[PDB]
Each structure stands twice: as C-alpha cells, then as structure tokens.
Write a protein that binds this ligand. Structure first.
Ligand SMILES: C[S@@+](CC[C@H](N)C(=O)[O-])C[C@H]1O[C@@H](n2cnc3c(N)ncnc32)[C@H](O)[C@@H]1O
Length: 259
C-alpha cells in the first residue's frame, strides 16, 4: 500500500460524525455565508458561485496557473473557475462545458467582471467531445468514491482527456484536477505526462481532508512520488490527531462589469 492507499482505507473506517469532524480539521475554509445568501436569492453581486473559485484563486495568486488568452473550463459546474478566469486581465475568452443535468450543477448566470467573455455550454460530456484549441486548459473534474478503484478510473479518464487536449490544442497554461494521485498507476501516468508537458503537483489547503485531490499545474515543478506522499502523510497525521476547527478566510469577491 502507498501511504495514500493506507490513508483511504482508514478514511473508510470513520463513522459519520468522525468523518465530518475530520474533513474540516485544520484546513483553510472560506466563509460562504454571504455567497449562499446571494445565490439562494438570485442577488447579482460579486460573490463566487462556488467554493471552487477560492481554490483557483489560491493557485493563481501563487502563479501555479496564469490564465491567459483562450481559456477552456472542462467540468465548469456553476462556473466558479470560469467567472474567476474571466476577470483576469490577460484572458480573452472562456469556453466552459459541463453536464448540467439530473442533479449535476448547472452554470449560474452572474455579472462579475468579464462575464460577457464566457460562453457556457451544458449538456456536454467533456470526455466525448472534440478538442478545441486554446491557451489555458482548466479541468476540475473528479468525483470522490469510497472505492480506490473507482477514483483511480475517474482520475485516469481526466488525465487521458487532458493529455489529448494538451497534445491537439496547443495549450500553454494548465490546471488539472487529479482526484486520486496516490496509486502506482496514476503516479506512473503523472510522471509520463510531466516528462512531455512539464509542471508539478500542488495541494490546495482549502481542499477538505476527506479528499486527496491535488492539481497538476504548469507554473511549478515538483516530483510525483515524494510530493504526493507528503500530502498522504499530512492527511494521515490529521486523522490521528484530535480534530481542530478550520481557519476561516475571506471568500472571493469580484468586481462587476463587462470586458
Ligand atoms: C468539482 S465540479 C467543478 C467546480 C467548478 N470548478 C467551480 O468552481 O464551480 C466538477 C463538475 O464537473 C462536472 N462533470 C463531471 N463529469 C463531467 C463530464 N464527463 N463532462 C462535463 N462535466 C462533467 C460535474 O457535473 C461537476 O459539476
């Protein structure tokens, strides 16, 4: 077992309240009270449509991804990454795609800075669509499962998708979710991908401890095995220690207007 597989097995043993306590222990967390109020009421202001905006902000503020030019957002959901990207000065267009049916999050219409540069398309399976060329590739797809096998499969689908888009579309910036980075097969594929496409792996401190998600990004360089293991060891130490409440930080608030 890798440390990550070992972590997953332990996670699966937690009861309901153990799991809840664990999942937010020692993490960073944005205060979503205002955002949720605004969304429930359809109020047009600068709040982020999802928790995801803050994750992309954390990576973008550190230069791990520097959205520019034509941005594609695969698995956009409500659109938290798309709206965040659209607000950035180097960004020309955002093409955003998501399933958007049967319970899956539909894009939410907002008027934050650059909204007019986004084209949202629902009813799209990004794994079964033609590559379109662009400059920035974002993909935030990866649904957790109790089963390592299922998470591994879901992750390989995303990595196979990203590989094809990166090869055919001439992208230069990327930020790709790796749901399950810790199995041998995935680590193997990540090493191969890095050899051809560069980049590194980052753990966003806003991610909950109940997911081992990391992001493959163009604006750093890391190894695979040690970098992933370090995260496994942190998540394991947090599960063995008593839980502590998360550290709150201000959520993403964007300016308004067209670009
Ligand atoms: C983690 S959410 C993205 C959160 C988003 N980055 C945000 O900030 O709001 C991933 C989204 O991918 C969508 N999705 C999953 N599989 C997909 C697929 N095969 N094609 C298109 N969208 C998919 C899901 O419905 C979900 O809404």
């Amino acid at each position: 077992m890798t440390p990550g597989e070992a972590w997953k097995k332990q996670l699966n043993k937690l009861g309901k309240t153990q799991f809840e306590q664990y999942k937010r222990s020692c993490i960073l967390e944005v205060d979503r009270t205002h955002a949720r109020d605004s969304l429930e009421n359809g109020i047009q202001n600068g709040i982020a449509v999802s928790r995801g905006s803050a994750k992309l902000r954390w990576m973008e503020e550190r230069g791990y991804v520097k959205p520019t030019g034509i941005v594609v957002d695969l698995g956009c959901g409500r659109g938290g990454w798309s709206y965040y990207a659209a607000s950035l000065k180097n960004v020309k267009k955002v093409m955003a795609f998501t399933l958007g049916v049967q319970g899956h999050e539909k894009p939410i219409m907002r008027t934050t800075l650059g909204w007019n540069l986004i084209r949202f398309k629902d009813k799209t399976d990004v794994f079964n669509m033609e590559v379109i060329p662009g400059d920035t590739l974002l993909c935030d797809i990866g649904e957790s499962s109790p089963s390592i096998a299922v998470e591994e499969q879901r992750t390989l689908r995303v990595l196979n998708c990203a590989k094809q888009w990166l090869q055919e579309g001439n992208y230069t910036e990327f930020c790709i979710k790796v749901l399950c980075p810790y199995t041998p097969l995935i680590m193997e594929e990540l090493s191969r991908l890095q050899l051809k496409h560069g980049g590194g792996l980052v753990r966003v401190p806003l991610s909950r401890n109940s997911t081992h998600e990391m992001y493959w990004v163009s604006g750093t360089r890391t190894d695979v095995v040690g970098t992933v293991s370090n995260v496994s060891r942190l998540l394991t130490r947090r599960m063995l220690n008593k839980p502590q409440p998360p550290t709150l930080e201000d959520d993403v608030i964007l300016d308004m207007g067209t670009r």
